[PDB]
Amino acid sequence: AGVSVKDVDAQKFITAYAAFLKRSGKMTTPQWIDIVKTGTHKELAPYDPDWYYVRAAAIARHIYLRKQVGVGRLCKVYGGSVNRGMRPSHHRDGSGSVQRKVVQSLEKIGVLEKSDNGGRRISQQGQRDLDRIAYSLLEEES
Amino acid sequence: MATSSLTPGVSLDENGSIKLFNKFPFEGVEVKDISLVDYITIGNGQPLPHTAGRFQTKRFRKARCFIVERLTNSLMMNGRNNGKKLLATRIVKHAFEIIALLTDQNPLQVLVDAVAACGPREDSTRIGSAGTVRRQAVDVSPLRRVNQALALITIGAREAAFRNVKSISECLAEEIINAAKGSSNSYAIKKKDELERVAKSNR
Amino acid sequence: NTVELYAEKVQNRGLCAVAQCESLRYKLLAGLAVRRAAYGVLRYVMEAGAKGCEVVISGKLRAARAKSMKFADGFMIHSGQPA
Amino acid sequence: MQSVQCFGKKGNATAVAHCKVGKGLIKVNGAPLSLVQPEILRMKVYEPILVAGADKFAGVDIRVRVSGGGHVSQIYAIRQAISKAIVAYYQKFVDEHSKAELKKALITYDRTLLVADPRRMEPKKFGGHGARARQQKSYR
Amino acid sequence: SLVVPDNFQHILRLLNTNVDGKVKVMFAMTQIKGVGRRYANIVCKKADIDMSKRAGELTTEELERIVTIIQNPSQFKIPSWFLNRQKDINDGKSFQLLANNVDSKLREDLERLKKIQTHRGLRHALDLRVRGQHTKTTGRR
Amino acid sequence: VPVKLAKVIKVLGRTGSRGGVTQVRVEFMDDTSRSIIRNVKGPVREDDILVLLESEREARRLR
Amino acid sequence: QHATVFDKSIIDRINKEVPAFKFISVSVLVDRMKINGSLARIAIRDLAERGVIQKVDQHSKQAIYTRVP
Amino acid sequence: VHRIRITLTSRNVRNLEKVCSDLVNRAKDKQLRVKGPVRLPTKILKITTRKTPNGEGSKTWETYEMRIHKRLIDLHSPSEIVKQITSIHIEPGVEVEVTIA
RNA sequence: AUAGCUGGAUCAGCCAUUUUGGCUGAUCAUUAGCUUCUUAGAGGGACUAUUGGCAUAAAGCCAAUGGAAGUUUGAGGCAAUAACAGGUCUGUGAUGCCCUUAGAUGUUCUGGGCCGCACGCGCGCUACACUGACGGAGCCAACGAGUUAUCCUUGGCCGGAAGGUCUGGGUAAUCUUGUUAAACUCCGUCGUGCUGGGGAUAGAGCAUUGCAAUUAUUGCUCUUCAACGAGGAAUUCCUAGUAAGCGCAAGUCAUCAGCUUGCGUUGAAUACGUCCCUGCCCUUUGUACACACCGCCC
Numbered sequence A: 001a002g003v004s005v006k007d008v009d010a011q012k013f014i015t016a017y018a019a020f021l022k023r024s025g026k027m028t029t030p031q032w033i034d035i036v037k038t039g040t041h042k043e044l045a046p047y048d049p050d051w052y053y054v055r056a057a058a059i060a061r062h063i064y065l066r067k068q069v070g071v072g073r074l075c076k077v078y079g080g081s082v083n084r085g086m087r088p089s090h091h092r093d094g095s096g097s098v099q100r101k102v103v104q105s106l107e108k109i110g111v112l113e114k115s116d117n118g119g120r121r122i123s124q125q126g127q128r129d130l131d132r133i134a135y136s137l138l139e140e141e142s
Numbered sequence B: 001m002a003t004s005s006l007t008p009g010v011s012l013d014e015n016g017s018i019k020l021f022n023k024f025p026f027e028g029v030e031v032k033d034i035s036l037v038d039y040i041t042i043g044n045g046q047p048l049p050h051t052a053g054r055f056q057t058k059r060f061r062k063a064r065c066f067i068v069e070r071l072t073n074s075l076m077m078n079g080r081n082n083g084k085k086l087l088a089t090r091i092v093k094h095a096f097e098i099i100a101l102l103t104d105q106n107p108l109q110v111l112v113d114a115v116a117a118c119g120p121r122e123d124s125t126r127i128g129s130a131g132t133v134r135r136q137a138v139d140v141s142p143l144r145r146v147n148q149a150l151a152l153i154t155i156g157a158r159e160a161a162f163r164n165v166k167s168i169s170e171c172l173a174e175e176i177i178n179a180a181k182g183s184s185n186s187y188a189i190k191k192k193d194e195l196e197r198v199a200k201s202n203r
Numbered sequence C: 001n002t003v004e005l006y007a008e009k010v011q012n013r014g015l016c017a018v019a020q021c022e023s024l025r026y027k028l029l030a031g032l033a034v035r036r037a038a039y040g041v042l043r044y045v046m047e048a049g050a051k052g053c054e055v056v057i058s059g060k061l062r063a064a065r066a067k068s069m070k071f072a073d074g075f076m077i078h079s080g081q082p083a
Numbered sequence D: 001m002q003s004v005q006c007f008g009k010k011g012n013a014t015a016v017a018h019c020k021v022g023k024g025l026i027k028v029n030g031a032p033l034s035l036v037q038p039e040i041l042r043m044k045v046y047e048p049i050l051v052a053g054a055d056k057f058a059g060v061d062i063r064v065r066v067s068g069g070g071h072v073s074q075i076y077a078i079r080q081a082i083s084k085a086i087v088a089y090y091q092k093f094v095d096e097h098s099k100a101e102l103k104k105a106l107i108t109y110d111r112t113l114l115v116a117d118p119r120r121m122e123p124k125k126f127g128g129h130g131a132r133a134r135q136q137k138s139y140r
Numbered sequence E: 001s002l003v004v005p006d007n008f009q010h011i012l013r014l015l016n017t018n019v020d021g022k023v024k025v026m027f028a029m030t031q032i033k034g035v036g037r038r039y040a041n042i043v044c045k046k047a048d049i050d051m052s053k054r055a056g057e058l059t060t061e062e063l064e065r066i067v068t069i070i071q072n073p074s075q076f077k078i079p080s081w082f083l084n085r086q087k088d089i090n091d092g093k094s095f096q097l098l099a100n101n102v103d104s105k106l107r108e109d110l111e112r113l114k115k116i117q118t119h120r121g122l123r124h125a126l127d128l129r130v131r132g133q134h135t136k137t138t139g140r141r
Numbered sequence F: 001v002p003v004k005l006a007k008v009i010k011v012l013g014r015t016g017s018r019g020g021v022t023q024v025r026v027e028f029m030d031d032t033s034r035s036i037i038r039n040v041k042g043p044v045r046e047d048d049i050l051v052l053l054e055s056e057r058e059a060r061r062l063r
Numbered sequence G: 001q002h003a004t005v006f007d008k009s010i011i012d013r014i015n016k017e018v019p020a021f022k023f024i025s026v027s028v029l030v031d032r033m034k035i036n037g038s039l040a041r042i043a044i045r046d047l048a049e050r051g052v053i054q055k056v057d058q059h060s061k062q063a064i065y066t067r068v069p
Numbered sequence H: 001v002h003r004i005r006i007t008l009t010s011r012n013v014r015n016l017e018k019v020c021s022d023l024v025n026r027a028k029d030k031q032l033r034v035k036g037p038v039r040l041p042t043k044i045l046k047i048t049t050r051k052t053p054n055g056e057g058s059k060t061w062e063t064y065e066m067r068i069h070k071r072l073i074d075l076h077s078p079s080e081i082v083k084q085i086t087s088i089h090i091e092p093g094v095e096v097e098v099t100i101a
Numbered sequence I: 001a002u003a004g005c006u007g008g009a010u011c012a013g014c015c016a017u018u019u020u021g022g023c024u025g026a027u028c029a030u031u032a033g034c035u036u037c038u039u040a041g042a043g044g045g046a047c048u049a050u051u052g053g054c055a056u057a058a059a060g061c062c063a064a065u066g067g068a069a070g071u072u073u074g075a076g077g078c079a080a081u082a083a084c085a086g087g088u089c090u091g092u093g094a095u096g097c098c099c100u101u102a103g104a105u106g107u108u109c110u111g112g113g114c115c116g117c118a119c120g121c122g123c124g125c126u127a128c129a130c131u132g133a134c135g136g137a138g139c140c141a142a143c144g145a146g147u148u149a150u151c152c153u154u155g156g157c158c159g160g161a162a163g164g165u166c167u168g169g170g171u172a173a174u175c176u177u178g179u180u181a182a183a184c185u186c187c188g189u190c191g192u193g194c195u196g197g198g199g200a201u202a203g204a205g206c207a208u209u210g211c212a213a214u215u216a217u218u219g220c221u222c223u224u225c226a227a228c229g230a231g232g233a234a235u236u237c238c239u240a241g242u243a244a245g246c247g248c249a250a251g252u253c254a255u256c257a258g259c260u261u262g263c264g265u266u267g268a269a270u271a272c273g274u275c276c277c278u279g280c281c282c283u284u285u286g287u288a289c290a291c292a293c294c295g296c297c298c
């Protein structure tokens, strides 16, 4: 009727849907999901233990909203100010080693597909999954 | 009515021919002041104070400006916090909420009374020319009352919230509440009392 | 034979400052009086149709103490696009 | 076919409103007015709707295509587009009297709802890091 | 959120550090010189222990487990690249500096570089900056 | 009793060393007479109400 | 010194005197009690999950909570 | 059915407009349906340099700019017409490109 | 059709549906028609017009409607006569004079130094946190730049994104690029203690740039984590999209910004004055000064 992922919060979807992704058994979190900082501009380590799940299922929303993205583009997106000590800060790219694995896990799930003349796109399966969950959160109230 | 978009039934008019604050601090009523009805501008509502109007290209466009807007402007100080109006209005919105919870009055009339009472009345200005250090007592214009009061509250809140668990919004709310009913305990009122006393002594 | 040259004779010669500067330089190299040479060129350009001319000779004219002599005469613009 | 296009801007930003026949549909870039990025500035973009009234704002479909500037510029541009879409729609397909009825209120209370702000960034001069402020000198 | 009336032993000690009484796990054993912020989390996950609870409630069995993983991380499927020291001079293996061994090896290596008379060693002897840091206007008093 | 409300009727000019204060003439509300010359630091315009606690001073000028 | 762990005294003190003051937040909890502040955040959450306290403008940093009447 | 594209890159607006007028005149002399000359954005080369040849004096800078304007066209000229038009429309200060791709 | 808008062939799926579809869209020289958002040549558009005010009622200003503008509409470029013993002989195959030349101050090569510190002075960056710091998420611009031997780089492959291998685009409003940037926003954690604030200093090793990196190139995985617990006499810049904070591009480039030249986002406090300090312009006035008060003289 009037429902789309264009007006829905998808961050809260991941926390509830982590169980469903485990039921599907296609996330395949790598062994280094506890040591890596997900970017050099980061300082200590990720805090939330579901960081890989949240990043994956939110990059899916990012790819939905976008036309087509690549690994390097996603690294630039997931950056920030880097504390360079006494020198003034600047912008540094993210961690390609975790961006590529996150996208590849999404492709194995099925929400993503490789687009022609582009890095990656979002499948109809991912489009329908995102729309259905967006409808659930938009319609559950009252 | 209802359309395809949800449009939640919370942001209705709920005004009575006004615009109101962000659906809680309220506006309209009478407000009013004793001697700043010409220098304090409380007319139509301002749902959020983050307005980008031009109020400095002329001399008295600052006078024809909202008191809360000038409070945000005088709060966006301490240059490490310069140019953050979103942070300033978030602090002000928080300060309005705690004021409304702490005191029965809505957080507009109390602020008007606070700045009205906080503004200095007699000031010992320097004569000048150096060496003489004589100084003389003079009066204060209503525009100077607004800016002096707003500055006094902002520095008072900032200094008293610089290092303590109490947040800036709570400190500003407490300062405004104390400065409203002449408590002689707030930093702004204490400074204005000292300024009036020294002006009287130097007179 | 990919490049060829055509030698045009002249399109006026009393208003092009480079030609007059060369003539003044050659006269100074010959050894005529600086004022007389600066005059001669200024009369030449004025007859050629100049509205206002300025000749400035700077350096060691007669002694070690170098100086600059200016013989500006006429209408001169020190401004933007007009200048 | 009731279709009309409008434009609005706040300097470096711009916004296009594709007003069309319908009801509601005040979405911006595919998302409604309730989900602008700055949560603390949503009432500013909702201001043109409530200045006139939801009763007189019905009967239009406004789609915005903002681009450029910052977040404050984006919300200013979309509110400008949503404020001029209704005026042009009610000028082209409704009586000019009602258009003026909307306009008088929309000008009586507005933060330059249809007047572009002419303020611009001053160019920077050599000798300092800002347009007007120059670096300090030792003097000794 | 958890059971409040439990047994506690306040102050606890492990590996040359008098850890405070009631602090969270990471803030508790970060006092020991040699462990890291990412090192704290990875050993906490590898030792099969919680993170929200305070370190005081830790029992002897978990203390023994944390000692074993701290002393021998290599034997528990951890590549040597994590450790700061690898392929040492005398033995030829990798280990971690957590106890007084860090100061002992630092002094021994300092004596070794004094013996071999390197430029970095001479700078260390003169108490100057070993790397290319300007000493023209800094390093005062 | 000590609270006096005065209304400015005209402005005279800048006085003092730096011009930081201005000499003005004020008139009370309940009393039409008694035009009082005063010195005010900040900018002052018409239709303003001045709150005063000491009025029997009759300041002439600021040096 | 601010308390680090609840000792069966602070819990009953807050559960009894939480409606004493009109404004409830981390700062006022550290003021009235001797709470560190992390426990103040957890106490605000543990009192807001029930009907003991009422949310007003809780978001970002400041936790704005008030007495039921 | 051949297609052409003249770069028409030049540094002077007056000379570019004159040669463009000549080109469109030759175009409408044969009625090849053409395309309107698309004015590509004027690419500007801007540099800054210090006035003084040494380090003494107040820090003053000079900014120099050079403007380049570019156009384009589309034709359907055969071999005889294209060789005639190329021999005719040659003008100073303008670079012309020929392609048939 | 070196950019978008729409239909057209063109396929993916439901909440409703076989008039009940919206919406998201994939491809696109398979095709057509338009330049309103992009492009710039010509253009219209400000004269403080107008009623009201003041000034010997002529030369302007104040507030206001209309407008994009009224401070010269903002900001720059060019900028008079005369002068400096102002800087540059090390920008110049620009230069007079002097010096030097085979055992060379000419040229070339190696290494070192220019960075060397008991100290003093300036231009600057980072902080001295709760408005904080850190972690999961969403994402908002402008000025520019890039290869014929050899730059800007897209897509694919394993892992300590430091990086590497293969394949393709761009000599360019098409590729980079839609510079999806930072600051920013939601939630959570650390809870005021020189603390997970501040990362100076040092220990070990991992790649890239380069004859090659030692006196650590640069960045990187780790550990220690100090002075700073918000600065005296003094002094600097600044009047509106200005100050200030934040980031980006370019110059110098084999590599290296804490610098400069420009741009953009957020965005103010105070004045609408004065000669009080510090200088400048004009007139009168005094002078025993005239390289002229940093004078002259006793």
Ligand SMILES: [Zn+2]
Pocket: I091
């Ligand atoms: Zn040179």
